[PDB]
């Protein structure tokens, strides 16, 4: 098994911001990592390309992955409408942790958040599966478009994405 | 995230005693710390200003926060009548610890207590969410107006309160 | 006590359709019933007057109550952001049953649904608290604007609402 790396090219209102690469911990949570990988390559016919980060709260996290409703109520996994929480081995240890958003136990679809702080209150409720490899500064740049309620001031989109390793 | 700091200007029978500031551990218990923060700013139209410490047991704790009934039977949170115990990450490790009072599991409202001792028998039953940053001497001053049964001899009031950090 | 009756006056875009009255089972679920009653009078400063039915699925139910986001993601109770499932005494026994919508256990706010069929697969998961007294024919008329996906074809609104009994 070798942990895959995927990239996201972020755009703010169409203008390029930069690339963020992610190492996916397939050595710990392989089903959750293959879901995010396949959705970044879009190999199964649908994926993250073109979707937006609908909720950004500075100093907490950036949430995205809802490619069907673009507002937090949609998304779907490559395994179907929802899939179980694989395990909770990994913890939300600091900035750049990539973890699954959900609506209670076993409702993982395609939404994720990138933590810009340590969020230990979420341990045991959200499956951690990746970490920003390069591009943390780009995630901090994204932060500047959020607010305490999550509203973005510009449309932050995943212009392109795919797998590197 | 940055942990907020709030202050309480305490008064005894009107005559001003001093200021206590508290760091609220938003990195561990964000919902509990936000409830305390917002009830100290008054931004929801209700809060701690003008309420009194109704139970002080020297060498144990000063309990306050009942702003609706002023006697231990009331208070409310910014989330409703009561809210869930957020988590029990922190322990009552010594003096200056700030913790939620309750009437059994998941009954948190606005009542809290400032420990003047380590109270480890309360661990796991009361949510710890803050610590005295500066002003311990004002809490030690407050102790002196309480008794083994908790009755105060003088009206210990939160004259003012708000946020700093 | 005596079981209160509330009424909703339904509008389709602008045109008045008719009034539906509901008996609320305060003898079984007093806290859930009082929540709906107070939101129908609007006595706490907010309530159902003017909100719409955002999801109607013909032969199943009409879902409303989201007066803050108007799309299924909001609503709030008179007791706060959410409240406990009171009990599951009553069953979804047939058309005209009024039950609480939720997002899993203990997430009752203000959203509800009026069953137009017997929905017993929901028993034990949604708190039943009322029954259509007069006006079932108006709920029948509302049905006609839905679709398999819940999308309404007209803006179905609660033009007026209040208590009768």
């Amino acid at each position: 098994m070798v942990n895959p790396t995927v990239f996201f090219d972020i755009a703010v209102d169409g203008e390029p911001l930069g690339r963020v690469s992610f190492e996916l911990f397939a050595d710990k949570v392989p089903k959750t990592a293959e879901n995010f990988r396949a959705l970044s390559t879009g190999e199964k016919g649908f994926g993250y390309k073109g979707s937006c980060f609908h909720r950004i709260i500075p100093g907490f996290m950036c949430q995205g992955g809802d490619f069907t409703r673009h507002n937090g109520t949609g998304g779907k996994s490559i395994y179907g409408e929802k899939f179980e929480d694989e395990n909770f081995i990994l913890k939300h240890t600091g900035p750049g942790i990539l973890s699954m958003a959900n609506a209670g136990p076993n409702t993982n679809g395609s939404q994720f958040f990138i933590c810009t702080a340590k969020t230990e209150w979420l341990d045991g409720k959200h499956v951690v599966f990746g970490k920003v490899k390069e591009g943390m500064n780009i995630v901090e740049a994204m932060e500047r478009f959020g607010s305490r309620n999550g509203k973005t001031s510009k449309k932050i989109t995943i212009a392109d994405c795919g797998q590197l390793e | 995230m940055v942990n907020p700091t709030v202050f309480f200007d305490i008064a005894v029978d009107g005559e001003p005693l001093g200021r206590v500031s508290f760091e609220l551990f938003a990195d561990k218990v964000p919902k509990t710390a936000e409830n305390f923060r917002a009830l100290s700013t008054g931004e929801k139209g209700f809060g701690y200003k003008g309420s009194c410490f109704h139970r002080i047991i020297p060498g144990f704790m000063c309990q306050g926060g009942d702003f609706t009934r002023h006697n231990g039977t009331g208070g409310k949170s910014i989330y409703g009548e009561k809210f869930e115990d957020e988590n029990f990450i922190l322990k009552h490790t010594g003096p200056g610890i700030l913790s939620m009072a309750n009437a059994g599991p998941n009954t948190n409202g606005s009542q809290f207590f400032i420990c003047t001792a380590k109270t480890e028998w309360l661990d796991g039953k009361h949510v710890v969410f803050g610590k005295v940053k500066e002003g311990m001497n004002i809490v030690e001053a407050m102790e002196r107006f309480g008794s083994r049964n908790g009755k105060t001899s003088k009206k210990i009031t939160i004259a003012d309160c708000g946020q700093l950090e | 006590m005596v079981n209160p009756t509330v009424f909703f006056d339904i509008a389709v875009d602008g045109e008045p359709l008719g009034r539906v009255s509901f008996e609320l089972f305060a003898d079984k679920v007093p806290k859930t019933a009082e929540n709906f009653r107070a939101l129908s009078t609007g006595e706490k400063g907010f309530g159902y007057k003017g909100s719409c039915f955002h999801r109607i699925i013909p032969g199943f139910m009409c879902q409303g109550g989201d007066f803050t986001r108007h799309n299924g993601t909001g609503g709030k109770s008179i007791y706060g952001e959410k409240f406990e499932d009171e009990n599951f005494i009553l069953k979804h026994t047939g058309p005209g049953i009024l039950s609480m919508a939720n997002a899993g256990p203990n997430t009752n706010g203000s959203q509800f649904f009026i069953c137009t069929a017997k929905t017993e697969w929901l028993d034990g998961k949604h708190v039943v608290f009322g029954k259509v007294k007069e006006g079932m024919n108006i709920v029948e008329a509302m049905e006609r604007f839905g679709s398999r996906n819940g999308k309404t074809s007209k803006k179905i609104t609660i033009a007026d609402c209040g208590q009768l009994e």
Binding site: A103, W121 | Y79 | -
Partner: peptide, 11 residues
């Protein structure tokens, strides 16, 4: 409060 949910976002 500070949660990351999909649909009923709470405080």
């Amino acid at each position: 409060x500070l949660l990351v949910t999909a649909g009923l976002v709470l405080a």
